[PDB]
Design a protein around this ligand. Structure first.
Ligand SMILES: Nc1nc2c(CCc3ccccc3)c3nc[nH]c3cc2c(=O)[nH]1
Ligand SMILES: Nc1nc2c(CCc3ccccc3)c3nc[nH]c3cc2c(=O)[nH]1
Ligand SMILES: [Zn+2]
Ligand SMILES: [Zn+2]
Lengths: 368, 368
């Protein structure tokens, strides 16, 4: 198996389907990558899972993870793992941070503990986590952002991407066995996105992420930015849209050339009473489901829908049994994998344009 | 070590403090018993944890738990474990049940699976789970309830309690090593509570639970029922108030003779942005905490408060980091154990009446 080899098997318009080959296995694209957890079927399973680096840094700690054999041991998962850099928390926790060109220092804890992130430390932490795909250390620019703020943020992130590249290359075990992605920034501004894409391609990366979206901008604006930003990235390398998104977000992003996705929505929705189906999202707490004998989705092949009716899950949640939210979450994660499979099939068949139209017609009709 | 020996070391008014000795260890009373989970600060630790039998019946299943060594192996917990009977879910999931004198059958699942609970099956399941304290199979009577509904429900549960006793006694390994509690019902009605207490004492149990409360009645009504119901139970045996409660609920229930407690609130509050402190509950999402450098509670000895400021937890939750809710929950669980220790200390000193008054004055002033 090669270190990192992206092959495109078929194309339709801007959409692609293919595979990323790595030493720990193959990732079918377009891919959805769910967040991995500590260790406690196939049609609903992922090819790669994610480590939330900031969380792991604080609990139980990167060195403790490394001593127990890295995230593959911790998560009981021998296939590829992608770790984030911390660049999202640089934004989302900004009021607890002090930023400089060197990096981001977080406020001291009450026990004197203090955490810092930089291009060098983020790569080191991702190495200690045993990550197969390493993200450059960036700043997810806040939204909305003035052109001035967006530009200074993006320029600093491009300097951090060069430092991330060099740090990664300085560790022979990491450079020989893992891969490194650069992250495009530039907010919603075309010229800044172009400058960011130019800077990343000069450095050179194994894959390219579209950063700074899924920060509250809304689908129309997100699609608009993807319309001009994705063609700026190298065509023959993977494109990873960070944080996106709803099922219809994912379909339209694939239509605009995205190959990889992650999103908090399957788990956040599942714990808040929302399930994704081919007929759109459903709020299982609605009284219409109190005697609905059907599974959450009548096509879904996941383990939950083989066993559990809408009525059961509705009453579990109403009765305060946490099993209700677990089932919603497990179904949502599995539904996302079936969506990606239908997307990949349709591109391979040369019918992706028709799939996207049929998908949207049924998803938005809400005849659940 | 004895199978089950309850000793009262000190008394003040109706309040008691003492110990329950069992083969797997000692339970200090009044006790708070948190819900146990699958295995992944002694002053904040419990003496016993709980198995949610209905959940475990469905996942992963009672037989699967038993084959892997029971709940002590499943939860990585060698100390005592109490399991519920299913009688709460007989109520909270009633619309998915068919009830008869024999027991309670739940609606068939989409895979043909079907679960039933009865005095015999509940005791059998609790045996397979490896429970040290077994609850009789009851019905948590719905609230509110007519006197007629309350009476038929309680009379049926008293027949089920006799069957539970016989089933428990029919398994020599369970009868020699575990203990069995009867559950008082009768809703808010004094005469029915008396009939229930009488019926249970005739059968004879190791401990006695006050069932049918913490179902929405409100503290004034809950205290009123405890006022006459707890003195109906045998004085020299433990009294377990199921589902209670808020910190001030627990103090007042101890004042009325309760020895054991369980409550969903520490975890439900911690997942919904509410933390318990000596100055009352706080909603950590309030903007006052955005730059509050203090821990959740200034006295608390838990692991969270040694490390984490209100500001950090406030921003973690706002940023959607799941770690925020984990820290809130862990602090709430630990705070409950410190409350019980202070309660036990104060009774031992003969200063519980003054503790309760000081507790309430400070907790309700809300000067956090
Ligand atoms: N580094 C970085 N991460 C982002 C994430 C987190 C994705 C992630 C990866 C791996 C694990 C968890 C989360 C975003 N989530 C929503 N919008 C996002 C934007 C960015 C961004 O611009 N930079
Ligand atoms: N069997 C039974 N359980 C109750 C519980 C669950 C306690 C429990 C024990 C062990 C684990 C979890 C829950 C109640 N919770 C709130 N009110 C309650 C009343 C009853 C009741 O009347 N009967
Ligand atoms: Zn499903
Ligand atoms: Zn604390």
């Amino acid at each position: 198996r090669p270190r990192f080899s992206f092959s495109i098997a078929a194309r339709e318009g801007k959409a692609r389907t293919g595979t990323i080959e790595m030493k720990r296995g193959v990732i079918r694209t377009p891919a959805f990558m769910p967040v991995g957890t500590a260790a406690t079927v196939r049609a609903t399973g992922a090819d790669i899972i994610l480590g939330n680096t900031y969380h792991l840094m604080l609990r139980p700690g990167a060195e403790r993870i490394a001593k127990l054999g890295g995230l593959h041991s911790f998560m009981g998962w021998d296939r590829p793992i992608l770790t984030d850099s911390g660049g999202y928390q640089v934004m989302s926790l900004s009021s607890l941070t002090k930023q400089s060109e060197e990096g981001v220092t977080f406020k001291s804890h009450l026990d004197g503990s203090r955490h810092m992130l930089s291009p060098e430390r983020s790569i080191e932490i991702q190495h200690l986590l045993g990550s197969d795909i390493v993200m450059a250390f960036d700043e997810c620019t806040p939204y909305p952002a003035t052109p001035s703020r967006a530009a200074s943020s993006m320029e600093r992130s491009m300097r951090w991407a060069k430092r991330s590249r060099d740090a990664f290359d300085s560790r022979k075990e990491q450079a020989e066995n893992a891969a490194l992605f650069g992250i495009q920034q530039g907010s919603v501004f075309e010229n800044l996105r172009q400058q960011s894409a130019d800077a990343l391609a000069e450095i050179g990366f194994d894959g390219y992420a579209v950063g700074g979206l899924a920060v509250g901008e809304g689908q129309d604006e997100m699609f608009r930015v993807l319309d001009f930003s994705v063609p700026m990235l190298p065509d023959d390398k993977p494109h990873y849209l960070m944080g996106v998104g709803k099922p219809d977000d994912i379909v339209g992003a694939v239509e605009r050339g995205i190959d990889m996705f992650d999103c908090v929505l399957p788990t956040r929705s599942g714990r808040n009473g929302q399930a994704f189906t081919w007929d759109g999202p459903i709020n299982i707490r609605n009284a219409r489901f109190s005697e609905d004998l059907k599974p959450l989705d009548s096509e879904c092949h996941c383990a939950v829908c083989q066993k559990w009716s809408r009525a059961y899950i509705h009453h579990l949640i109403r009765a305060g049994e946490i099993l209700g939210a677990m089932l919603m979450t497990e179904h949502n994660i599995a539904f996302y994998q079936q969506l990606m499979q239908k997307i990949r099939d349709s591109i391979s068949e040369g019918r992706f344009s028709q799939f996207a139209q049929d998908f949207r017609a049924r998803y938005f009709a809400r005849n659940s």
